[PDB]
Design an enzyme around this catalytic site. Structure first.
Site, PDB file in Angstrom:
ATOM      1  N   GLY A  23      -0.739 -29.462  10.133  1.00 54.83           N
ATOM      2  CA  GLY A  23      -0.768 -29.115  11.539  1.00 54.83           C
ATOM      3  C   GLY A  23      -1.770 -28.040  11.879  1.00 54.83           C
ATOM      4  O   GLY A  23      -2.575 -27.645  11.039  1.00 54.83           O
ATOM      5  N   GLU A  24      -1.702 -27.567  13.114  1.00 50.88           N
ATOM      6  CA  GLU A  24      -2.656 -26.678  13.711  1.00 50.88           C
ATOM      7  C   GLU A  24      -1.979 -25.852  14.792  1.00 50.88           C
ATOM      8  O   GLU A  24      -0.891 -26.198  15.257  1.00 50.88           O
ATOM      9  CB  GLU A  24      -3.753 -27.589  14.275  1.00 50.88           C
ATOM     10  CG  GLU A  24      -4.978 -26.954  14.883  1.00 50.88           C
ATOM     11  CD  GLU A  24      -5.872 -28.031  15.457  1.00 50.88           C
ATOM     12  OE1 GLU A  24      -6.773 -27.692  16.257  1.00 50.88           O
ATOM     13  OE2 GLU A  24      -5.666 -29.217  15.103  1.00 50.88           O
ATOM     14  N   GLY A  28      -5.500 -21.422  13.520  1.00 58.92           N
ATOM     15  CA  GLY A  28      -6.301 -22.247  12.646  1.00 58.92           C
ATOM     16  C   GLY A  28      -5.566 -23.529  12.312  1.00 58.92           C
ATOM     17  O   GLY A  28      -4.921 -24.101  13.181  1.00 58.92           O
ATOM     18  N   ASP A 140       8.468 -12.627  17.151  1.00 59.75           N
ATOM     19  CA  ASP A 140       8.213 -13.973  17.574  1.00 59.75           C
ATOM     20  C   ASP A 140       9.061 -14.984  16.842  1.00 59.75           C
ATOM     21  O   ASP A 140       8.590 -16.013  16.414  1.00 59.75           O
ATOM     22  CB  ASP A 140       6.723 -14.294  17.492  1.00 59.75           C
ATOM     23  CG  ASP A 140       6.313 -15.439  18.396  1.00 59.75           C
ATOM     24  OD1 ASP A 140       7.071 -15.768  19.328  1.00 59.75           O
ATOM     25  OD2 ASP A 140       5.200 -16.006  18.176  1.00 59.75           O
TER      26      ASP A 140
END
Ligand SMILES: O=C(NCCCNC(=O)c1cc(-c2n[nH]c3ccc(NC(=O)[C@@H]4CCN(CC(=O)N5CCN(c6ccc(-c7ncccn7)cc6)CC5)C4)cc23)ccn1)OC1CCCCCCC1
Length: 342
Positions: A23-24, A28, A140
């Site tokens: 994934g991305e 990055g 987060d």
């Protein structure tokens, strides 16, 4: 002939081969790869941060924190690949244990049993106890930052927005801009908090627990102040005492301006949930951050009684910036040196 994934060069050879896309994100791209030394597949992420100070800061926090921490419920760093000289260094590859999935993908696709919810929640809190014991705030926490292996072991990831706790400097104005993910933001962020207290992370865990119960985010707002519409819509109007803690007039008068809203009972929102899970949820999703349960209290809650064992819930051996990108590159370079030939 370096390997390439989806049009990015992955300059990680010869140690790491047979790469596959995972994934991305803004950070990055992440791939799986075969580690020819340890003979296992690994995760590798390619970071290209050096053009901007903010991305440099996030890269350095991630590396520094994850290299210092050692905990079963926190992703480690196994290796870092970068060029041999600062001049030639444009990308940093961070090699980490490969996991099967993350909780975001898992919740999109799978119903969790109560036993799974319990075990997941235990591990999140066990990992968080260690983080908080180091005087660090994750800031987060969300499903996509919780990684799972095929046997449902869980690891917390992404320390790019982490900070050292600073409760005496937490206070700010109303509707002050914030970076962390909107559905998991505690109500005080919108009212009067910079998110420098450990309670911000407990709120996020509460939202994750609710999401595990129903497979749907509990407070799916659309924008800074809509997030508060959703929170108040379920918790109901704050009490006088909880308002007395909000001294800032803009935030207080906003809340006073709203019509009275009744609390929505947890057991009506989650009619299939374990009643002990709902009691703990209530304590995590407490409006007033001063009354909100702390991580060690949460671990001791009856819902988690099958797992709770403070002797097996370790803490950090010790507790734990406006530098320009040039100086941050030098610090990333030095912090990654241990992984170079030597
Ligand atoms: O081969 C297989 N396949 C099966 C396995 C399938 N696995 C999956 O699908 C899977 C794996 C994973 C996963 N596994 N391991 C991982 C390790 C790490 C992560 N992700 C992270 O750490 C995130 C990404 C970014 N990071 C923050 C960060 O870097 N930092 C630093 C950078 N910073 C930053 C930098 C730049 C910018 C930026 N840059 C440019 C512009 C704007 N911003 C922004 C932020 C943010 C903080 C936080 C995920 C995983 C997750 C989800 N799904 O068989 C097995 C193998 C075969 C053998 C048998 C076994 C099983 C089968």
């Amino acid at each position: 002939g370096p390997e390439m994934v989806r049009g990015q060069v992955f300059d990680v050879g010869p140690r790491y081969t047979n790469l596959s896309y995972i994934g991305e994100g803004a950070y990055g791209m992440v791939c799986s790869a075969y580690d020819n030394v340890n003979k296992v597949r690994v995760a590798i992420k390619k970071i290209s941060p050096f053009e901007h100070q903010t991305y440099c800061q996030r890269t350095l926090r991630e590396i520094k924190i994850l290299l210092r921490f050692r905990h079963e419920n926190i992703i480690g760093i196994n290796d870092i690949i970068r060029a041999p000289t600062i001049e030639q260094m444009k990308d940093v590859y961070i090699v980490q244990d490969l996991m099967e999935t993350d909780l975001y993908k898992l919740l999109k696709t799978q119903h969790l049993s109560n036993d799974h919810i319990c075990y997941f929640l235990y591990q999140i809190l066990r990992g968080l106890k260690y983080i908080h014991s180091a005087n660090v705030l994750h800031r987060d926490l969300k499903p996509s930052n919780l990684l799972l292996n095929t046997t449902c072991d869980l690891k917390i990831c992404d320390f790019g927005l982490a900070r050292v706790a600073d409760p005496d400097h937490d206070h700010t104005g109303f509707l002050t801009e914030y970076v962390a993910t909107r559905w998991y933001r505690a109500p005080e962020i919108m009212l009067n908090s910079k998110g420098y207290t450990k309670s911000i992370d407990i709120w996020s865990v509460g939202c994750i627990l609710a999401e595990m119960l129903s497979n749907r985010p509990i407070f799916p707002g659309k924008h800074y102040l809509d997030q508060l519409n959703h929170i108040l819509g379920i918790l109901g109007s704050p009490s006088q005492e909880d308002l007395n803690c909000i001294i800032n007039l803009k935030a207080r008068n906003y809340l006073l301006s709203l019509p009275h809203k009744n609390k929505v009972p947890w057991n009506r929102l989650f009619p299939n949930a374990d009643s002990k899970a709902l009691d703990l949820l209530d304590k995590m999703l407490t409006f007033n951050p001063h009354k909100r349960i702390e991580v060690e209290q949460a671990l001791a809650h009856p819902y988690l009684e099958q797992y709770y064992d403070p002797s097996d819930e370790p803490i950090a051996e010790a507790p734990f910036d406006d530098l320009p990108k040039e100086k941050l590159k030098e610090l990333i370079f030095e912090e990654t040196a241990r992984f170079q030939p030597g």
